[PDB]
Design a protein around this nucleic acid. Sequence first.
RNA 1: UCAUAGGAUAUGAGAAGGCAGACCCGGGGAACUGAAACAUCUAAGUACCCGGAGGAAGAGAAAGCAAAUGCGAUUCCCUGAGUAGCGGCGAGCGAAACGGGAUUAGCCCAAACCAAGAGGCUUGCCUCUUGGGGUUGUAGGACACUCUGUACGGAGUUACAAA
RNA 2: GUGGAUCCUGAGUACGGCGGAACACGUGAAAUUCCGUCGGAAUCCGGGAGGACCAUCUCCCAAGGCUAAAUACUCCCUAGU
RNA 3: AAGCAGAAGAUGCGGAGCCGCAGCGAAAGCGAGUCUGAAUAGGGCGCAUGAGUACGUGGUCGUAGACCCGAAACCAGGUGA
RNA 4: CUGGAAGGUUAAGAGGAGCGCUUAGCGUAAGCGAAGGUGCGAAUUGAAGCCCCAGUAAACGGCGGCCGUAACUAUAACGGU
RNA 5: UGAUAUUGAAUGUUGGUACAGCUUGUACAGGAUAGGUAGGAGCCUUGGAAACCGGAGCGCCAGCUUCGGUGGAGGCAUCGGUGGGAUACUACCCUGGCUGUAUUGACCUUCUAACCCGCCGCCCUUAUCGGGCGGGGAGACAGUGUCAGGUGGGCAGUUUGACUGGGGCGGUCGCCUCCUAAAAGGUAACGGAGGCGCCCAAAGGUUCCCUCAGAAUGGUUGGAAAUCAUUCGCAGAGUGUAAAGGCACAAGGGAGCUUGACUGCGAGACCUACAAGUCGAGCAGGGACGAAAGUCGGGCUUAGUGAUCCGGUGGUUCCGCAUGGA
RNA 6: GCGGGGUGGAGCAGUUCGGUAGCUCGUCGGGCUCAUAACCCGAAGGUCGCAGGUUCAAAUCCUGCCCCCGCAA
RNA 7: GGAGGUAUG
Lengths: 49, 573
Amino acid sequence: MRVNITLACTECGERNYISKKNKRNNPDRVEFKKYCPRDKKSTLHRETK
Amino acid sequence: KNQRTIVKVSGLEKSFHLRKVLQNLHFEIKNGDRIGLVGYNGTGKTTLANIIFGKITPDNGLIEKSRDLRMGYLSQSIDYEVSHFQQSIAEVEEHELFQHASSLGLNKVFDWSEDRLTHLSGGEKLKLALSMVWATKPDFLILDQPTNHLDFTGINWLVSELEKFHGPVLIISHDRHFLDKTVNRIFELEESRIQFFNGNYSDYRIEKEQRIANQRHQYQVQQRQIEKIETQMVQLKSWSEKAHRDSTKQGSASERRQIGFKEYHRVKAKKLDNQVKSKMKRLQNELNKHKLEKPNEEAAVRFQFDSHGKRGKRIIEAKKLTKMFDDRILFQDSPFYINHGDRIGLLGENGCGKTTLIKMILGDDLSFVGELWKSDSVKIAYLSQDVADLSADKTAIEALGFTDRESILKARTLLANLGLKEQLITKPIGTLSLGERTRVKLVDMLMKEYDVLILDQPTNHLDLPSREQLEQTLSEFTGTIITVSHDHYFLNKLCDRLLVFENQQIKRFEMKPQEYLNKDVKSGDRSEEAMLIIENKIALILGELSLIDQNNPKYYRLDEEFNELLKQKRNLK
RNA sequence: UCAUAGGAUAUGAGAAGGCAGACCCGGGGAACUGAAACAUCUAAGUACCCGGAGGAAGAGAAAGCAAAUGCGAUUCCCUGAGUAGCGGCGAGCGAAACGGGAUUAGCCCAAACCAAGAGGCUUGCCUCUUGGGGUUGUAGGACACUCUGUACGGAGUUACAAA
RNA sequence: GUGGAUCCUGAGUACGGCGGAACACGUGAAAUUCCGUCGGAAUCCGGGAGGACCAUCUCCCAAGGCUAAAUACUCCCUAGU
RNA sequence: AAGCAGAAGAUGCGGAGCCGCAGCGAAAGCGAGUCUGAAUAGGGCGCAUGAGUACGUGGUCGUAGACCCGAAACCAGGUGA
RNA sequence: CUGGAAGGUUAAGAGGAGCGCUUAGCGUAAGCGAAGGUGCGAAUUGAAGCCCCAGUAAACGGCGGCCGUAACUAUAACGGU
RNA sequence: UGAUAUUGAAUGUUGGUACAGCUUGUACAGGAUAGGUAGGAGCCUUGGAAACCGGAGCGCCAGCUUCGGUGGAGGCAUCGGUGGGAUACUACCCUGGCUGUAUUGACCUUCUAACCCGCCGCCCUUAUCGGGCGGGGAGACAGUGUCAGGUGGGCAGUUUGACUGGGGCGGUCGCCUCCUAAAAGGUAACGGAGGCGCCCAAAGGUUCCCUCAGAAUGGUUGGAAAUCAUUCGCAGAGUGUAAAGGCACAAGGGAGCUUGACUGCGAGACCUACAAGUCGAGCAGGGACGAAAGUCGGGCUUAGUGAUCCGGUGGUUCCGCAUGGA
RNA sequence: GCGGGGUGGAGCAGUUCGGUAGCUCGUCGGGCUCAUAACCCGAAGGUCGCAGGUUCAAAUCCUGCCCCCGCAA
RNA sequence: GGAGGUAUG
Ligand SMILES: Nc1ncnc2c1ncn2[C@@H]1O[C@H](COP(=O)(O)OP(=O)(O)OP(=O)(O)O)[C@@H](O)[C@H]1O
Ligand SMILES: Nc1ncnc2c1ncn2[C@@H]1O[C@H](COP(=O)(O)OP(=O)(O)OP(=O)(O)O)[C@@H](O)[C@H]1O
Ligand SMILES: [K+]
Ligand SMILES: [K+]
Ligand SMILES: [Mg+2]
Ligand SMILES: [Mg+2]
Ligand SMILES: [Mg+2]
Ligand SMILES: [Mg+2]
Ligand SMILES: [Mg+2]
Ligand SMILES: [Mg+2]
Ligand SMILES: [Mg+2]
Ligand SMILES: [Mg+2]
Ligand SMILES: [Zn+2]
């Protein structure tokens, strides 16, 4: 129901962040602009499948 | 060529929201397999097929298939494929496609306008969709819900063609009879787990019963064991408590004071406790080792067309009724009527105009010649053949359109009885399975306070429990029922009169669907009267001769007449 | 039936058994115990039983160690090192090569080929038996070519023949 | 000592599967060695090893045997501490 | 150190090897720095603020029965009707 | 326990679709890649047992609850579940 | 119980592989049983056309198929039409079925020479052992070896909790809040009360604005109590979730934009046997909100969790047992 | 104090997992019969022990309260 | 034409 997720940067693919979401409230792959340490800038991170 | 595995699925998992649809499915499709994928509505059959085809990516698992494999997919949203037919003409070798088409009964498809091609019968859509898939020369056929709208012709065609097909075929169907002719294996998808059965669908049914019976029996045996041991434990406990309680109160005053008295008795109590602990531990360990889960308790679809009051005799009359489309006459000078309580089956091949007439009766189509009278006081419920009527965006409640709490409660309660729970109600209809969409349309019918039921192909997209429940209910309904179905069994059970679409004429026949087909031309009906009377005399004389000894003088006269009458029988034949 | 088994006679410083409660090489092979329980593991290839022996036994003259302008049989001591590693990665188990030393020692066949002889004639082939020949690796040998000795000289009963 | 025409250079062997054991190394990425069972090479244009395995290179030539010294031990003998 | 000379000795020879003078890092590696890090930033561990080594005595610890005595048992090979 | 018959499930062993590593070669590179070797290997095949179906109790074993009812009452021959 | 070795021979049946032959091909229309593609105007013809008959297979009941006997000169086409497609004939192929050649197993019988005989006769031999020979029976099984599955208290090695007003039962075992707790902190009992093993994509951040509960009175449905309107009204409300401590320059309510529920860290502190746990200004990178100051490293604070070993996955200027890879 | 039960008149499901309140017998009304039974045709009878919450929806989930039955007592 | 046998009240 509420599960752990990992957000991968959409530029370099790196799984930079882990978080949780409630699957019933947010069933779709979440996206968040977060700092990617590899790219040294804020980039869109999308939940991995 | 061989039986090399063509499609191999392993550990296929797929979920939607929180609902697991497919849970750990391992199966292989080999060359020449004719597999029936069965299971009730919403079990995931279309979902599975789409994953096999590749329209939906699974959450876990691998799908192994030849990289070059061509997979012909009949799909459920024919509307999309048929709308692209104009585009398909440029991409497919015209010749082969049209060769098939004519066999399926779509004659001269070349000449159809884009209007007609957008106005097709649902049975025509399927016939056109089938011809397209087979002209593409696929190596693997997936046929989601075929024979739904097909007539006798298209079913004979689809059978004879499936048999010929060289590759494997996966058929998703609820039609017992179509499966009983084309498939040799059944994939039953229940509780998100696929079970395998050998043979056709009828034997699957039988074998499934036995598996359920065996499973049920075994579960009961285990439960009996558990209860036995719990009864033991309860008894031993009680004893242990009593033992400790009495440890200090036994014997006379002096004997109670003996040294070590209560310790002796309490030691005995401790032994009883050890038995309980051992019984418990063993029971727990045994369950962990082997704990059968309670067998599935199949849900029971329940819905009843509550009977209305009394109304009047006439409800429909047609005089010199003629319907045309541009220059094509659908039917001409066709007089018929329907009275209250008639159970009318509309019989006719695909495209003959069955659905057209219904739209005229409802008043959606006013473009006809003649008089078509309908009682103004007739409230009609109407399950439409075209499932795509409902906007596949609205939720179940929005499609019903009820706003007051009382109406909502009835609608929600009925939906729940039909197996659509809160989860599915709040979702856009576009997500519902094709049979779930049909249970939503049924609720819109039940919530109407009506007098007539028009059921246009009521057995497509419906599982055995829903079809069986519908059959029971419709047999009890005292109002008028008009049903179009090419499932002749369903028609033959429900309908007692027929409107036949033949040669651009609608004729009413006062007989059951089964009798009409098995008729035999009356070319010699003026002579059958003679054959009937003479033969009945033969029976009378033959009967008497059976009871009399040859030595009775009465025997001689009867034998002469018998031989003479037999000569007459020969002369008439 | 020839034969063979079997039987008889003669000839044998042939074997047998013992132990030195040790050492050596093998066939079989525990458990207590440790792991703070216990089964993988440990104890331990130990105790014990059995066989073969010898004054020693086993190993041994590279299908080796290594990664250098390399080394050059085996065995044992020092060291590597409680390292590398193995391990319910737990308890524990635990090297080897290089380097320094003791001691030093290398050889002989099978096969190709030659000669002789014999039996299967398998019929100009083959097998077996004698002697010669021959023994190794960026190859050696046979086989061809030369040179050379045939004891002048060398070795030896601890291998390299045997008293 | 010179030849590189031809011939010889250890076969149910090496090696492999399966089951065990020995290697410090408990199946592990497990090389190397040994056993039972089954299968089963090349043979000089050949073969083996350098810790799965392949390629290149380096080093050797298995499936025959013999070989003293340095080492281990003492029931016993002699002389002694 | 083994080992070779020597009274079963001292000693002489024997420099292989061992510890220390340099640390940081998992490692490549760099070095009074180094690792982390994008960073001449901060921080960790080090250096500047230094003494080790060989032998002997004593205290304690590890492996050995390990301060001494004591089971009921287990296992192996035998001896007894 | 005995006897069945198909079918389902199952091991070794047979089968080797395919995939990885290696590299002659192709190529400016990236990378692709024959053959051979090598590490994995799916389909198919593969018995008993089990599942399934019958029988067997001098086989192991087991051998119930609640409610009502008769012209004194009380109990129920009787009835319900 | 199966595979396999010991372990052989012949036959029959039935599948797979390769080849060859026999051939096999009906939507509708069209002259009718039109398999695909290619060339195609001549081809066949006493080397027997058509036609007659017999035989046979198939068959959609139209019919085509070929072994043939009578038969003796035509028969067929591109043209024509039909249709989606054209008819002869030839070249290369496919569907289906059939036969044969060669393999490949599985299975069926049968055989005899392996193996077996606790059968008979003879010899060794005064011998109920053993061995040899000759019959007979059985026979490729059995037995035995290797491997595998099932069964297996017949036998074997072991395991089968602690706290505790004795032990046992019951209860408890980790974490958060309060009281006991004696006005810092800490503080026990099987002392008194409860909660936790989450929840939120906004219920987080920022910018701006904002007050709550309750009562009286007035009001259509309307009722003690729904919505309004005035007066009184420190919190008598609310604060996701226990309790305590806080909160009205709000931490409570509403709205706009956003993702700081950031990356590297971290002076210095709290707590503490250790392992852990907690707080943290400030620095750098790149951002959200804001005009700016500035705030933001989740939530009013304090529960919502599990060492190591061992595995899975992603990244990687690391290592790679001669060398390059792996 | 510790457990189990309260569903039309009787005996029983359904409760875990919310979705039209049911099965057998009985009662009541009307037929058949001279009349009763059997039989045939219809109907009533519980809002699931009681009172509140949660929910669109509660016999079912939660909160309290009252009865019945077992033990201890 | 007659003999013998073969549910409640
Ligand atoms: N894309 C989707 N998103 C969410 N739910 C879905 C989606 N597709 C299917 N479902 C739901 O998951 C289940 C799968 O339905 P699915 O169409 O696969 O069944 P089906 O076997 O085809 O049934 P039917 O025969 O009734 O068509 C159903 O409950 C359906 O409502
Ligand atoms: N507007 C239209 N214009 C032209 N032709 C039409 C139009 N609507 C329908 N048709 C054709 O006329 C016939 C009428 O089809 P309709 O769906 O009404 O009946 P049906 O074939 O008997 O129904 P079913 O869908 O149940 O098989 C079909 O051939 C359809 O293609
Ligand atoms: K004895
Ligand atoms: K035991
Ligand atoms: Mg007593
Ligand atoms: Mg229609
Ligand atoms: Mg569907
Ligand atoms: Mg121990
Ligand atoms: Mg023990
Ligand atoms: Mg205790
Ligand atoms: Mg006590
Ligand atoms: Mg205090
Ligand atoms: Zn990035």
